[PDB]
Write a protein that binds this ligand. Structure first.
Ligand SMILES: O=C([O-])C(=O)[O-]
Ligand SMILES: O=C([O-])C(=O)[O-]
Ligand SMILES: [Mg+2]
Ligand SMILES: [Mg+2]
Lengths: 497, 512, 512, 513
């Protein structure tokens, strides 16, 4: 687990001591989010994806119908619960709804035309010289000389435009208006229906597209209402305004997605890494989950092995400190969905061992405010203990997940076994790095003491069965003093029985 | 130039302060190496590549003849010298010879056979099948394959995309099952991870290629599949007296090379992290560990390191890179690579110029994002104390460069060494290396931050005036390139007497 | 308050620049105060006032006095201590320390008048005994019968003020030149820097004194002139089974002890930097080096270290210390001494109470001035990885203490160990160590930040209730002492089971 | 040697654990030694031995003595100094410091008579001049006419270095006080009124006469007593006028107000003295170390000289060896980063003035080796502002080089001192040989740590280049003769590009010839 490197006095010496022959621990801390689609929506494929390490099933509402998504969610649940007969080896799987959001698109039976460089193409609110799109106000917000991007930014341009970068035009392609004054509501009537559908389907989180300000986050939250109040809102930062207004967005949100696809069109591609590292750093500092997304293993759509760049990108997103990494096309429509999941799992474990925890822990603690929240004090202390004894795990009894989130913030090397009886908490926990959620099914014991002890033993059995630790190893256990929530204040250092 | 981020007390706060609206300086410090091939070998394309930011022309001797490469070298020189009429705007371009080394290749089927998962394939060295490869029988050039592989061994073909498992071993054949299928073409690369592969690091062919390199006056050799220090010594010995100044860059592309990296780094002038072969020879998820390890060790040693292969791979076919590719180039610079390299992108890609420009843009951004506070401290703490007055002058100049936020460090250098000593300490400011030696001007591109300039003015009579002339030349270059303006402060490194190896004078001077 | 503005600084320099005399320190005083008891301080009334002023340990110097004299002194210390036992909340345990005579060389009799030694003059040194009471300017007797055999050499007399160089030596005789002259009186101490002494580290006299110590139920032994680990083992062996819990503090007061410090530190319960003899045995200008070295190594080991001798020397005769003395006490605390010690100041001085109060005041100020940011980091980086659950619990507690700026760390401890483990990590907040063991309550004063409290309540049947009772006791103490108020947060350390060595539970709790 | 093993530690804790008493320090001693001259030390022969033992600055305490007495003392200092002037390689500049009386309160005459004040006894205090020479155990006169206005019932009055303490019981023309701490009371002892608001001028008519005398006597620096605000420093500077404009003003911080207004005082001053005597009476004694460490840290940050003063080796007035506390105090003042350390009674009136000088020299060299330069250089760097001053950039770069090659010295050609002061600010381990032709610059340079001033007497050469080389060679000869470095060793050399001041911009790393 790169322990030789972990004991270096400088980051440079740490890098010099990284050893390919030093195997990582069994635990994988970084959550894996997989977009489900044609390639991956069958129950059998989903079982293999869960086996390969999928933690969250992402549903992309830019496409498909409520029917198609309902069936997909049913299949995800069927695949998940197929492992429910053994609670020790069960793995919670979360469901994420990704909103369409303010998408501009062009005008299943699809043909494509060839747009040529130098040619003039007119835009109107399906072929060379006339192109229709759904944004009725385009003519107001753009000027001649502004760029218009079409089909993941591959094509670049009444509206009279010249084709700067041509290609196949297709149908119903997404458009980017680089920081034009686009007035499309952050929550459209379509989004409202999709969010309500999400609340009915009992989704764990919403990935809200094209969030530009705090008000947008409040709109999403308001639409979810009382019934959806526990659904996590992850704001996708995918334009210049969202990056400029990141602080107010981060305050209003439950977490963040660095949505690098749109972002790399909306801002110069060479600057995306700056925005990524900035958002991850700020989320780490805030203790709120951050997802690195889009084109992480893109070539695996068509190839059984990633490029060297892709391998580097996944590793660096984990070293930057992403809580989750995400597959899009790779798992939704790729020829190698299982290989993609396995590849993310392998790279994440390696990168996790290669984290300079000495510096990370210090900096995290120095930038955290002093507080008289007893749970926060307990969390940081537990992480310290975890390091001091090189503990096999941190076991956390949590009902809402908050206690486990507080531990996760301080980035322990050891996995955080979060024991809960709340299924939603067990699913949502995957948003946080190092949180290994376990769903206790055992009936409530008679003495609260005994109910606590039993939940701990559950965790001990899971850690043993998963090869996180052995009998005689030391683990950290976090409990409360009083039944109920927000009373986590007890840390114990105990041998595994 | 991310100055707000550069003043953070913690790396975390540094990251939180990275600002997309903070534009980088004009200077680009990381060298760009471009593989030359069919897409890029024309004089016109080469002119545009130099304009776009190419610093080193890499020639891949895995392919082509001496004739083909001689013409390529001539074209590179023609394109380079087309800008020589203005020494202020001239850019030296280095030539790199990349050796074939112990390559294993398949036979001939352009034709492709479709391999299906589960299907049987037989491997043979019998030349009867050299040009009769198909979905049932595959010939390869490694005559001793049957000796070094066992039942259960993997054989990887075509950049590791096709994978075969040995099921039965014969006297002169293998029966294999296709684990990962796909299209199999002609003359594809074969990797035998964990096999006992018995092939010389320097073949008789490599010896001829190296001799040709010495005749052609190449600046550096990228030596393939270096596994131990002895391999580097073989290359060095083959170059002889005439080639003694050619830089040997060892390509680390297998398990053994990574394990013996210290002895290799000692024996070599520099390193290339050759991630293509490396990502097949070791698990792909470990490549980043090997990369970061080698870069860190090279930086500590003050020897050049190149990050190579598939940095902007998708740009072979697309005018824009993936998000992963953008991140990879940035992270290689942040890791502290001296140079970044394009392979297929420039050799055979549809967008060679865009690829060069993209590396130039990402490198400048990543260079601004370096946490110099920590980097400079750590570098100094891990460098040994020396009696060498030039080492002390260098470190002092880098410190001063920081202290006054200098526009550049101007270094008068004959052999490169003084500028290399400055480069080791990673100043933010560009190092304008003034030389009259053309080879030094070319070779200087291997080091980060070294902007080499070739003074052609005759040696003036008063040594002090010969010095002033060369400093003024660098001032004119920096002004014309928009590195600094009149009134700005720069650092100047000179020697106390004529010759090489007497650099000991640092001056802080206004730009005139 | 408590210089917390300074504690937030990113650099030690900025920390120093932020030290504020107008920022008043917390009520708690963490550094133990050891006072030598003698003619000025042995009365019950004076002892009561010394306890009030802040005395934690009563040191008995066995270089002087009889068993009778010391027994009465111990009785008086106990009488004074127990006079406050009627209120367990406001009671303060007081430890008794026996300081051994050890291998002392002393001069003969001149009445108690003096001769004048002149620089350059010859002096004879003799062990004859015929000159035992006839010492003069020509002949000096001493009790070390083996002197003429171990010297070849400088000889120091009377606190190192008189210095003699051996000019010529015979058996039974020695001739010296007076290098530094002065007034020589009767029965002065002799030091032989280097000049390897054969005297036993534990003499027959020391054996009797140690046995007396065991009979009197002393808490700790300060063992004089420890030179090696074997010496520490001899002391430990002499104490036997009955004395097994008595702490052995090795006094490091010669060059050999400093050179063999690691083996001594391993064998001992703690260390005293005995600067008197040490500043004669090694050049005075090097004592600070030895002090800082020993304190640093003790802190790193988690074993108590005492800074001793001449800390407030001028207060023997003056009601206020010098500026140097004020600085010395502050720097000993900043170096990280667990205890500071008064010798002549309290034993024989005119102002024993003022001396105790002065140490109390300076210690509190210096404790607020501690750069906890760097100290805690360095402490953790130099501490070994262990599977001791109590060690992991302790460090975690100290982190928590910082994170919430807790008013105290409450520790239930039977042997002291758990509270010692907390103390090692140097929390700012006071460590309220609740015990029912009186010896543990006394011995705890050897460790910085440990405020020992002696619970007298009977053991409850329900272990949980017995724990709660003891925690409540500590809450009452902290409230009454003004360490914290109702609603404040404190850290509580408990074990999971009755017994010793099971501390593993940390709670963050409001004060009720 | 020179605690190099300790200097390479990754942490300050490990650095402390690696301090080795058997590791000898380098020959060079970087911390300036200031000695108060008086009855014990004013002879030419004693002064020669003090210079030999390591005295850098002769401090004259104008709280005592006459102009005549001090003029003779200055003459003697000069005579002793110039006795070594025939060899410029082995000559050592010695500075003269005038320490002002400042707003003191002093008691009357009992001259050299004493009374015994007993604890619990009543003592009457009076400003009535009738008792000015009739002080006794019952009535004590003092010179502060307004005392009765500024003190209250319960106030403390401290007399004679705070050794005698009186509590005001009754206020009248008089105060009735109870003696809390008694002892022997002599004539003309200092009085402190902690927490009172004393209206006395920072520069009294006496101070004005003493300052004028100082300008006539060509003193190098003024130690200005009881500075409370920047305006006080401006008063001193104004009194010195055009003729005294180059004299360095060192503000003595010795009261609560001075500590609170330290930043404005530090801005206005050439440097600072932590005057711990009065300070430890004016503020609680247990806080003096906080004020000391604060002022030293801030002076280091500013690049202005700081002196640690008073009672550093006090017991050596009467004893040939210091206490253990005194040894520790000197070492810690150097570790804190004082530029100079100071002897008062030890050298002025003590029985062992030479031993005291030698002891400060020894302890300073040891403490200098024990500095954790790794952390100190980094922090100094991270706290210094970015500037476009080429001399500042050259200075820091030189210090870096000095460390990189473990240079034997940094040779600096300086006319005003400034370039050498800029080097000193970054605290190189290597000694700074400051070559000047200006004698006052050579004397004033001792205020800065590591600056070893050398006074070139050679005529100015016609070729500027040769005049530079001559001065560099002079420094090479000095460093060789002083055992700072040997032939073949590396040194750093700082020069300017043109004749004049404020042109230092050239650094060279050169072998010693
Ligand atoms: O003997 C001692 O304790 C001393 O020298 O301090
Ligand atoms: O006046 C002084 O020097 C003092 O009080 O230290
Ligand atoms: Mg999107
Ligand atoms: Mg004064």
């Amino acid at each position: 687990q790169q322990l030789h490197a972990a004991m270096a006095d400088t980051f440079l010496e740490h890098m010099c001591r990284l050893d390919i022959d030093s195997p990582p621990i069994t635990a994988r801390n970084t959550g894996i989010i997989c977009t489900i689609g044609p390639a991956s929506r069958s129950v059998e494929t989903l079982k293999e994806m869960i086996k390969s390490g999928m933690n969250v099933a992402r549903l992309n509402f830019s496409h498909g119908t409520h029917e198609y998504h309902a069936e997909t969610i049913k299949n995800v649940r069927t695949a998940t619960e197929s492992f429910a007969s053994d609670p020790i080896l069960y793995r919670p799987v979360a469901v994420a709804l990704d909103t369409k959001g303010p998408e501009i698109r062009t005008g299943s039976g699809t043909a494509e035309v060839e747009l040529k460089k130098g040619a003039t193409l007119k835009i109107t609110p399906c072929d060379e010289n006339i192109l229709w799109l759904d944004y009725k106000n385009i003519c107001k917000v753009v000027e001649v000389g502004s760029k218009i991007y079409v089909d993941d930014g591959l094509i670049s341009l009444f509206l009279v435009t010249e084709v700067e970068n041509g290609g196949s035009l297709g149908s119903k392609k997404g458009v980017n208006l680089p920081g034009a004054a686009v007035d499309l509501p952050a929550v459209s009537e379509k989004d409202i229906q999709d969010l309500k559908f999400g609340v009915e389907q009992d989704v764990d989180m919403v990935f809200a597209s094209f969030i530009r300000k705090a008000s947008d986050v409040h709109e999403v939250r308001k639409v979810l209402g009382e019934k959806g109040k526990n659904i996590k809102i992850i704001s996708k930062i995918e334009n210049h305004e969202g990056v400029r207004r990141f602080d107010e967005i981060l305050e209003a949100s439950d977490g963040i997605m660095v949505a690098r696809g749109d972002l790399g069109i909306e801002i110069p591609a060479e600057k995306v890494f700056l925005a990524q590292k900035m958002m991850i750093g700020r989320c780490n500092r805030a203790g709120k989950p951050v997802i690195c997304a889009t084109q992480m293993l893109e070539s695996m759509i068509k190839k059984p092995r990633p490029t060297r760049a892709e391998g580097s990108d996944v590793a660096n997103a984990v070293l930057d400190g992403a809580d989750c990494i995400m597959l899009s096309g790779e798992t939704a429509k790729g020829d190698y969905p299982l290989e993609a999941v396995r590849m993310q799992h392998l790279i994440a474990r390696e990168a996790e061992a290669a984290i300079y925890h000495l510096q990370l822990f210090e900096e995290l603690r120095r930038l955290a405010p002093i507080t008289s929240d007893p749970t926060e004090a307990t969390a940081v202390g537990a992480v310290e203990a975890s390091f001091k004894c090189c503990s096999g795990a941190i076991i956390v009894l949590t009902k809402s997940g908050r206690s486990a989130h507080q531990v996760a913030r301080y980035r322990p090397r050891a996995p955080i076994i979060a024991v809960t009886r709340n299924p939603q908490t067990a699913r949502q926990a995957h948003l946080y790095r190092g949180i290994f959620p376990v769903l206790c099914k055992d009936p409530v014991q008679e003495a609260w003491a005994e109910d606590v002890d039993l939940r701990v033993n559950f965790a001990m059995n899971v850690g043993k069965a998963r090869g996180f630790f052995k009998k005689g190893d030391v683990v950290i256990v976090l409990t409360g003093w009083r039944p109920g929530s927000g009373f986590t204040n007890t840390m114990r250092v105990v041998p595994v029985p």
